[PDB]
Subunit: 226 residues, 6 copies
Amino acid sequence: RKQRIVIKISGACLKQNDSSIIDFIKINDLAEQIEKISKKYIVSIVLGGGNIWRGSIAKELDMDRNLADNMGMMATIINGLALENALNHLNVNTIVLSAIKCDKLVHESSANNIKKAIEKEQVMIFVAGTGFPYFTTDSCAAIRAAETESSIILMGKNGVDGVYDSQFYEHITFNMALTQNLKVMDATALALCQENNINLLVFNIDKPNAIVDVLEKKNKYTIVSK
Amino acid sequence: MRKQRIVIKISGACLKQNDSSIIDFIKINDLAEQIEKISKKYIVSIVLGGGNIWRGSIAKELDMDRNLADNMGMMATIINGLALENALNHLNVNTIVLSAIKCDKLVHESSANNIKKAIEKEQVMIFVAGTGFPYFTTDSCAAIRAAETESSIILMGKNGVDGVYDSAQFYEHITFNMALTQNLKVMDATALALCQENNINLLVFNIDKPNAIVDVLEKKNKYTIVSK
Amino acid sequence: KQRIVIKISGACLKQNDSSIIDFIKINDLAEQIEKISKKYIVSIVLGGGNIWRGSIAKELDMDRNLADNMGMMATIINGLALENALNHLNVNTIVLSAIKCDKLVHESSANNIKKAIEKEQVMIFVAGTGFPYFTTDSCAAIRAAETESSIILMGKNGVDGVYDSDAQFYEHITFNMALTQNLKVMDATALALCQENNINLLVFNIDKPNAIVDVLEKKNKYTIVSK
Amino acid sequence: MRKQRIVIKISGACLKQNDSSIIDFIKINDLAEQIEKISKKYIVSIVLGGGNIWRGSIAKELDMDRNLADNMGMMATIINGLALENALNHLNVNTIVLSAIKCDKLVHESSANNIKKAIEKEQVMIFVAGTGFPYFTTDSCAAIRAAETESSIILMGKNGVDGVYDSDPKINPNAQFYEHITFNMALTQNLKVMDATALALCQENNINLLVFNIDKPNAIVDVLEKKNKYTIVSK
Amino acid sequence: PRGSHMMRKQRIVIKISGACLKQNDSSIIDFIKINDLAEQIEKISKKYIVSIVLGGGNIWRGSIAKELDMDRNLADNMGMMATIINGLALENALNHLNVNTIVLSAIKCDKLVHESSANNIKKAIEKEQVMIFVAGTGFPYFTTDSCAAIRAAETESSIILMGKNGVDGVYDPNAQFYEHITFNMALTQNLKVMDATALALCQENNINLLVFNIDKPNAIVDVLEKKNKYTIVSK
Amino acid sequence: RKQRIVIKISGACLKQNDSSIIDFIKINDLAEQIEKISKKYIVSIVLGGGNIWRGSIAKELDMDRNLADNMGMMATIINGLALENALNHLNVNTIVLSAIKCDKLVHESSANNIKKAIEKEQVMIFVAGTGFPYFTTDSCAAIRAAETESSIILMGKNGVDGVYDSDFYEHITFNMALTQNLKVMDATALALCQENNINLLVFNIDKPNAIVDVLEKKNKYTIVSK
């Protein structure tokens, strides 16, 4: 009866200040929530690398997009190993699955390994995106959702309670989103979610117990469905 | 001389004549002949489908979940990729098969480095096994490869159809916005989004016709441009 | 628990040219393997004739190194299809490939075979030896010796066993009489491999319903090849 | 030319200006410009640290065991390695990233063959991910890479300090500055120019140190021309 | 020593040089010697988490490298291959005694051996497998002793059993026996217990040595029970 | 393709006595011959490991066949790197191609890598057999000959001039060797050679300049064909 979910966790969720790329209280709070959630759900985590690497630094370094996205993928691996460590301390059975092969550090994602991880009911930490440039964290979240047969992506926003207009939305269609010219995710991720019937649960991730609370429908959130 | 970069999307059906053989030698050789000529003026990336070997309908019959079904399709593209490479080798075209899935005994792996290296050598790049991920179409892979190689245009070969219609009125030029508004199925929504985000144009034409790929680059027949 | 190799040619998985793999045929195969796996340690060696043949290689002017590579990718496709069919029957199974391709299959090795035997998984051997100039029969012989299987089930498509030529049915023949009589049970390489390592053949008609189960219970017409 | 072989140890701090960005483009481009000029006279091996991205203090905060902590550090050096390669490619320097950990989609693997091949081609070798093993420092890896490439000297760039002193200069306005010191004198005084393991590796294989201030403009080029204040550690 | 129990076992590294596996020149590996070793490891593995670090001297030595005009990078590579051969032989011997065992290699070679990594070591310890460490560090300029130190630190083993071929422990004919020496006392007395690098690594990570005669029957079992003549090296 | 040859070099060719697994004078003499030969031929070398590992030691160690053949494969890699070193000192362009992947030591054999090595006209040193148990050095020699499109295998014997009936045939047929019951190669290697029209050139390899001489038809040798 365990239903499957993808939690999109951007890099900003792991960082407090510029002094440290990863903040221990923020990542441990995250781990604590995942611990509780993993009792009722099969959990897939899709991480960003914005705390370590951003598009702005790529421009400063005159870095072409192929290489820039590669840097981002490495950043997600660092975050992935940090989250795994935090979850291991809580005795949560967890596995880091990477789109890029690097056996000394992480396991490789594949149809077999995902299936294997689901049977063991491991928390799946997905890293290095798709192993391809020109993908966003959101697009990877879409692909991972379809791949793991998760019908919903929890889309944590940093500061924002859900879909607004920079009036709140309790619920919104994908159609009504694109007619209203709202940038909930990039166009590619939107298309991916629509094609494979994946819903979004947009909420404020900065709030204490945010992820636990929105699965209990406790706070302000937006659902983006067909 | 001086070469601009193009992606040619070649579906599985372009390589197959009838059900007796998954790959037809005349069709693949004709394709290789055209690529030979084109590679003198362009840096050529080929993105192959596997429809001649593997289809979505067979996956249903075998009660095959999507993760596995798309993996079968990826292996199909590798077979096609090696066949095309062989045909191009016979014409002394410098060529390399770059795979999204690692398989050293058969193919080279696609990567930032290997693509860059193949471009410098001006090799025809045969891209194979899609993105290595399920839930992607050949069109989406074409978009990703175009962005990755900095190709501004994808030649979208259609089997039988001259371009973009509405069923029967012919368009010479349409916008991506104009496309999905008229509920036209040029590519899947994901591929469309990818092309728009990265300013990649489509050149839709009939690929079944003799010398079709060569002729559309010389603007000689009926075709449709899709831009922003 | 006795160890066996079942040689399954590509034609066993195909009905007609419209589809490379037929769901009824592969499901029937899986059903039989399911039952057999309760009494035997099962190794499956697959061909790729349903997808790729020697005749297409000639048409494409394809040299042998590449042609055999095409065939090996064909067996992987078949291997993943059969694994899927067996998974739906809750049979513990693993695809072991002679060619490394981690995103799709596991690699065959001394360790992984040993590990698969301990777990009593059905072993689906794929991509031959990873080398050109090998037949499916030769791979079956190597896999038999490697798994310490004393017998290869040699499924033929249409033929009840070994005859004079196709009519006298042989109940039992020797590999020595499988060249002396000018017959062609397997290629010479596979024959030598089997003799070298004391591997016997059980030649039977695999097209018949329940054929694999029946021959292990000695129920139908079959030929023993030994000595 | 008959190029002599050198290892340049570049810590993470050399690539970072402030906390807003892990890698600063001016600092890394300045480094690349110097390596460009140096590579005309020398076969250059670069050994990078990852302190701009990852440090030991973060590992403690995250309650991270040492095996995992050092793995984070190795991934950090790969990021730095790819950024430096990019900077050098823009200056048309033939360069290769050689990693102690296999990761084909991003880097080449270091091996006896690949090093030999890179030396013949006279590429700048950017060594990355240390030894692929925990319990090694950047210094230790620099020693190993020096021995492996048959480099007789390691340029040991320090951030702010001009070289080896008998004590911290920031405190004592009376600290001796050594233009040359032996490993022997340095250990009886208990100076820790490098960690004990790196020191032992250098002594075992007759590798010398050239300690200097890396923050100064043109520092690496100048020290090879013997132009500024530097400490040679030898014997 | 360490003297542990059946649950929550202490972790040890046993350094087994190539000479322990060879009787004479007619065969590189002697079945009696390797089976005796396996028998001891079987008994020891009941009370300890056991890591074995093997040398390759029975197959390859430094002297052959000189004869073949072989540079160090390649020479050490030959040695690493030798340890893999030894590793597979010991694993076979241990498998016949039904000891759960795994060969972990610093060099990737999937058809022969498993790769060592933080994850695989952790996984092997959980399963309480005997870990046979092979191919050193995958790098040249390391001795078997230095690999033993690195493996000890990596596995969090507090002690390395240093089997010597012929000698009961540490001495200065009729020499004086040391029951205990410091690492300081080790170098300061010119006593070559291990190479300088291995010594440094052990000091840095607080790893002790247990030096004993490995040629004697039941030697490894007996020194863990404190039964014979042996030397502790420690801080 | 025709002017390509396979030279089968057993382990015994590299060893003088038990004190050293590899003898420098024997291996250097072999290297000198290969140097001269590689000017006129595309050379594939198939090495055995009998100088380091043999079947008799496997029995003593109670070693199952799968593991025993694995030991032998690692032995050939050691020999392969030794021969490469000897050829490098003579400035011969050479590459070690292994049936088993081990990137830190050797390159992997494949259709692409063989093709690439042939175009470069490198001496190919084939190592680790087929990567499979139940193969002999002779069988590997057959497979490499067919793979490289070599029409002939130089079958160096240690002590014997050619094909007798033990202590002389100048030309034997394959079928004749079977009727006569001669042990030229194991049955599998014989079948492989016949299937792919590969000839054998059996000669005494212990003799000075033996390999060079037999290609110039200079000494006593047996030619095997069908």
